[PDB]
Amino acid sequence: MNVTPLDELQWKSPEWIQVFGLRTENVLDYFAESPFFDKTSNNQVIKMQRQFSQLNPARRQILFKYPMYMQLEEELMKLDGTEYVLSSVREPDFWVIRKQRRTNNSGVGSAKGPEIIPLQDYYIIGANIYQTIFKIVQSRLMSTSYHLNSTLESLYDLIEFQPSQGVHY
Amino acid sequence: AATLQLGQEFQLKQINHQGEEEELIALNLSEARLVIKEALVERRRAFKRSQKKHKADDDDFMHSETREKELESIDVLLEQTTGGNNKDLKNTMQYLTNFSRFRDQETVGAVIQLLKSTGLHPFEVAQLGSLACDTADEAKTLIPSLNNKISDDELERILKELSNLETLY
Amino acid sequence: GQALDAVRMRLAQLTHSLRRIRDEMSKAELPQWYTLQSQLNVTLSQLVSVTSTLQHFQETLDSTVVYPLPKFPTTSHESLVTTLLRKKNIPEVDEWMKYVRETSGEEIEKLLQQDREITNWARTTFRNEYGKHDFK
Amino acid sequence: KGAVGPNNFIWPAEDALRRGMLAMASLHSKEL
């Protein structure tokens, strides 16, 4: 069953931006309803935990700028696994998240902190979301080769040979 | 020129007939062979034009299928342009043809761009265009001027790229 | 970065050769056939080298992660960013291999091994045929 | 520009067409 690749997949939510608008405060809230947000990530678990509790270079800059991002670490350091964190922000139109997974290897002999490993690239441009360059290059080259093949077969069709002259047109 | 001792006669700054300082020009086997071939064919064309004044085929000479056909065209060019009185020119042209690293003008331009993008000395650039070295240290030892002036990683990258650029015969 | 640098220089020379063949085809008068063959063969073998070198360094290209510059402004150059970002094939090639697969259309595996044995048999047969007659 | 005001655009709104009854009419084209 034909599936559109998620790298080119682009979601638009006019109702959400009309109701709430685009801001770093609710950029994760905007991302929550997208298909790219896995329901198995610990961010959703933290979200239900918060809901239950209520019912009952630029990395350091964005680190020190917002306190909710602080709360994100102090709620995310306890849970290791696939997590969604912000990468960088330039207002009022550009935001990009950092898709990384954490394995808090607390074993004896490792003086490093929890291991952070990239998984995917996500770019929020306007109200749209974008998600390999190797594929782009090979696709461009193969389409170029197809066009070249068509041109060369047409040119060879145009070619006419005679023994007494050689090849002419 | 281990210590870049080029003397007064071959200074880096040259005074031309116009009186303006120019960078000293150094050509490897490929560049010199292409330049001399172009000059010879231009002189032959001028001679033919003059003969027509007193009283098509030239496209096949520059484009050679093989080394032997190129040598035959070279012999014909020397017969029709030099007169056969200059054996040293024939020996130099044969040495250029047999050990020309690069036959196509575009590839020679690529080699020139790769070698002189770093801004090295023209002597070193011409030597690198003449010599094909497997390892950076081999070139550095065989070219004492390149020592202490180019990083080993850059030299290795340049040598590997040049080896890849060599057109298969 | 070294692998992508080599890819850059080789693709740049390939694009230069493409520009060449372009501005010698754009002339109102067609040059001699032989010059066209030489240009075709040189550019096409250069494309082969491009493919081979891109094959060699897949790991370095894959390991790299794309990210826009902090200094690069997206508000004014979003069109330029989207131009390079998009990667979907041209449609005509798409329905091209769709019709190709339509025409082509444990069983598949044993046909695959039957193709293996036909290939090996044909190779051996032509080796024998070449050995039969002295070609030197 | 940043405030999306309803029912006043130069060009027809995509959200207007989404909220328009033509969307469900196409969805309920079988019922037609």
């Binding site: 080119e8 638009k12 | 993008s117 | 989207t82 131009t83 | -």
Partner: peptide
């Protein structure tokens, strides 16, 4: 040096083929 730089071969007129489909909520 560099014999000649490459001519700008930008094609902004290219319409692109981005698939758009997950717009409905």
């Amino acid at each position: 040096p560099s014999y000649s730089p490459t001519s700008p071969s930008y094609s902004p007129t290219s319409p692109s083929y981005s698939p758009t489909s997950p717009s409905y909520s």
